[PDB]
Design a protein around this ligand. Sequence first.
Ligand SMILES: N#CC1(CS(=O)(=O)N2Cc3ccc(Cl)cc3[C@H](C(=O)Nc3cncc4ccccc34)C2)CC1
Ligand SMILES: N#CC1(CS(=O)(=O)N2Cc3ccc(Cl)cc3[C@H](C(=O)Nc3cncc4ccccc34)C2)CC1
Ligand SMILES: [Cl-]
Lengths: 299, 306
Amino acid sequence: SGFRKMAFPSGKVEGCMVQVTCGTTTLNGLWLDDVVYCPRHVICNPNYEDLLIRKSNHNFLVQAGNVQLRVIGHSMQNCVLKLKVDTANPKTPKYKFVRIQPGQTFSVLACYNGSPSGVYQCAMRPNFTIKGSFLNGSCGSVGFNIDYDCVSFCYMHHMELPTGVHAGTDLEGNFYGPFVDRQTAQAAGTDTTITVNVLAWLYAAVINGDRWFLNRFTTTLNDFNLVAMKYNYEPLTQDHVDILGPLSAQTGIAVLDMCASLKELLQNGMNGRTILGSALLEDEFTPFDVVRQCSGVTF
Amino acid sequence: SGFRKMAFPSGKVEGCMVQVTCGTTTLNGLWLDDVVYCPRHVICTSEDMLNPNYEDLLIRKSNHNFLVQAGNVQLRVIGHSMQNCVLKLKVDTANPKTPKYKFVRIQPGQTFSVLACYNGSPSGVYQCAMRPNFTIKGSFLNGSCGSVGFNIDYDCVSFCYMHHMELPTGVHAGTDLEGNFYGPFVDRQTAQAAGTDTTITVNVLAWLYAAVINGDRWFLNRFTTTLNDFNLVAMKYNYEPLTQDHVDILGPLSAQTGIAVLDMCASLKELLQNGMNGRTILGSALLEDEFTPFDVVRQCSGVTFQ
Ligand SMILES: N#CC1(CS(=O)(=O)N2Cc3ccc(Cl)cc3[C@H](C(=O)Nc3cncc4ccccc34)C2)CC1
Ligand SMILES: N#CC1(CS(=O)(=O)N2Cc3ccc(Cl)cc3[C@H](C(=O)Nc3cncc4ccccc34)C2)CC1
Ligand SMILES: [Cl-]
């Protein structure tokens, strides 16, 4: 029993974190085989090709623990800088670079000066920001998931927006969202609630014994989406309904029956009650996260 | 900016997790140097759990009855001893991944990270607090026994908890790494229940200071309170008494924000009376009590968003 915001074990990623220094900027890098990946703003209206051409390999100081790595090459891929080093990381795990979609969750290993500080779980918001916890020096910290024994790196931290939320790129340097890596006027767009995730968390509450919100009613997908659009909830698709199939079979509550419960919660509130110790509807657990935590999958 | 329930990086602990088997029971062990620590109930059957005599059950076992597996490698047990509710299995190989570590016993209100494991393999990491009633609100399934709680302030791991059982209310009970239980619990399936739980007042105040540091002040008021009047009100909402030690401990956060501890207590009294009125504090509609004053200072900026 119990339901916690759970992150993946971070050890395989901790063994890849390094400190990258160029000029007065110090930030974090990800050392995989003989390449260090880091935000291209470590070299800083920036013209990154003009700034980069003026740098020599020895301008980049890379430190792994108490060991200095020597940079032997450099190249830029989108908003990510790739520093070729003479030493392959002996701790390189089995890995992939994957781009995630809004609504998907991942673990963040927050680092400062190449040293891991903490691990937390978060979701890519529908507005492409993440509600992280990052201070100055956290740039280059990474987000990941683990599948079997393989680390899928999905996020690299680049900046904080004026509302306190965060923006970054995939490991190929493509930003999530309409953001740019420059000190300019930027803002997160209006965010929405991840409906499929709220439904997954309601199934998790049922599995753990919280059933007060269940009712005898059902709804159609069309009527549910009309109500959900009114409450700034993301539209629920047939793919979301299919994805929730296993949880619907385990609890005996059809997805549209759980949608009827969610409509009543949106229209009436909780009335002094809580669900899994929360007075808000939680949207940062995917259907897969719920199945994984209620089954004990290991890595 | 931001404020998350943040766990310590788990790598140093992952390299210590092993699987321990005795007969038909399998659970997790912590391998530090040449010793594997695990719950002594690994020697019990489910029948034994009503009134087990651990001394009598243990004397019938030899070293080769304990199977210890680290990854895909079988470790050889060369000795065994019981210390309180933990079994210590001497092995013929010292763990080459043993981090710098200490065994620390914590007090209620303290937080720690839990690395939940099954079959000696880490599954996930989350942040927890030792409740005032000595239980923890964890997330554990069958096979999670032997999973550990820890803190890593600096590069030294301080192990503070080892998981032993789930009580009927769904909450969890365990021991320190010397095998002494937290709370009035026994590693016996007897009618024991968690006592009435209370809110960790000093932690709620720490989290209100975290909200101020992150730029929010809507909940502040023009009042102050005496410590005794605060405690008289707090007890009515099932909040733990606030002591002078707690007031002293909150001194640094008070100095950084410019809000006196008793002035923050007055704000808490008003939040208990009025609720949040559709508002949130650090993304929560409830008063959060699983961040200590130390956790707030570690995570938050040293400069307040005035
Ligand atoms: N709005 C805002 C702020 C960011 S900034 O203006 O100082 N900043 C502009 C900028 C522009 C583009 C790029 Cl790619 C990076 C960056 C940097 C960046 O965000 N860094 C950080 C990242 N994360 C967490 C931070 C917390 C605190 C200060 C910096 C933080 C620097 C003040 C928070
Ligand atoms: N009430 C209750 C329950 C526990 S039990 O009755 O199966 N159980 C009695 C018991 C008594 C004392 C001792 Cl020391 C160990 C133990 C064991 C124990 O707690 N194991 C576990 C531990 N953690 C999380 C579990 C989740 C699910 C099933 C077992 C879980 C076995 C059913 C939840
Ligand atoms: Cl303590």
